[PDB]
Amino acid sequence: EIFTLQVRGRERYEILKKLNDSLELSD
Amino acid sequence: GGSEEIFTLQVRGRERYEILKKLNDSLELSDVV
Amino acid sequence: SEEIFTLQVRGRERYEILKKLNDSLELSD
Amino acid sequence: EIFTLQVRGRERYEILKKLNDSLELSDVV
């Protein structure tokens, strides 16, 4: 199941992308 | 208020989406970053 | 008072991210 | 470089701990 999240702001997107990528690797 | 720019993040799995949505919603309200 | 917990965070940028999230959640909660 | 993050309350602590633990395993940042 794939979901899209709309993120406002460049830095906010980069933070949430990093967290997403981290969780993908760690889970 | 806040940034005018918008970017789509793809998330795999409901649990992970819920965590990230919670953070995203928090940041929209607080505007910390 | 709300009880204080600590996390040891490795790296300045990692710390800065988690601090911003902490502060955001304090404000939105 | 280790930074100590202070967090108020269990709910925020557990979210941030999950993230910190993930980041330690992945080293994304």
From Swiss-Prot, chain B:
Physiological role: Multifunctional transcription factor that induces cell cycle arrest, DNA repair or apoptosis upon binding to its target DNA sequence. Acts as a tumor suppressor in many tumor types; induces growth arrest or apoptosis depending on the physiological circumstances and cell type. Negatively regulates cell division by controlling expression of a set of genes required for this process. One of the activated genes is an inhibitor of cyclin-dependent kinases. Apoptosis induction seems to be mediated either by stimulation of bax and fas antigen expression, or by repression of Bcl-2 expression.
Domains (record comment): The N-terminal and C-terminal disordered regions undergo liquid-liquid phase separation (LLPS) following homotetramerization and activation. Post-translational modifications, such as phosphorylation or lactylation affect the ability to undergo LLPS. The nuclear export signal acts as a transcriptional repression domain. The TADI and TADII motifs (residues 17 to 25 and 48 to 56) correspond both to 9aaTAD motifs which are transactivation domains present in a large number of yeast and animal transcription factors.
Identification of the protein by name: Cellular tumor antigen p53
Q: Find motif (Nuclear export signal) and give its ranges.
A: 18-29
In terms of the parent sequence, the fragment covers: 301 to 330 of 373
Q: Segment Oligomerization: which positions?
A: 4-33
Q: Which family does it belong to?
A: Belongs to the p53 family.
What is the protein's quaternary organization? Binds DNA as a homotetramer.
Give the coiled coil ranges: none
TM segment ranges: none
Q: Where in the cell is it found?
A: Cytoplasm; Nucleus
User: Which effects follow disruption of this gene?
Assistant: Morpholino knockdowns show a decrease in apoptosis in response to UV irradiation during late blastula stage embryos (4hpf). Loss of mdm2 transcription increase in response to UV irradiation. No effect on expression of perp in the eyes, midbrain and gut at 36 hpf. Decrease in endothelial cell apoptosis in the absence of blood flow. In double morpholino knockdown of tp53 and yju2, tp53 deficiency rescues animals from developmental neurodegeneration observed on yju2 mutants and radiosensitivity.
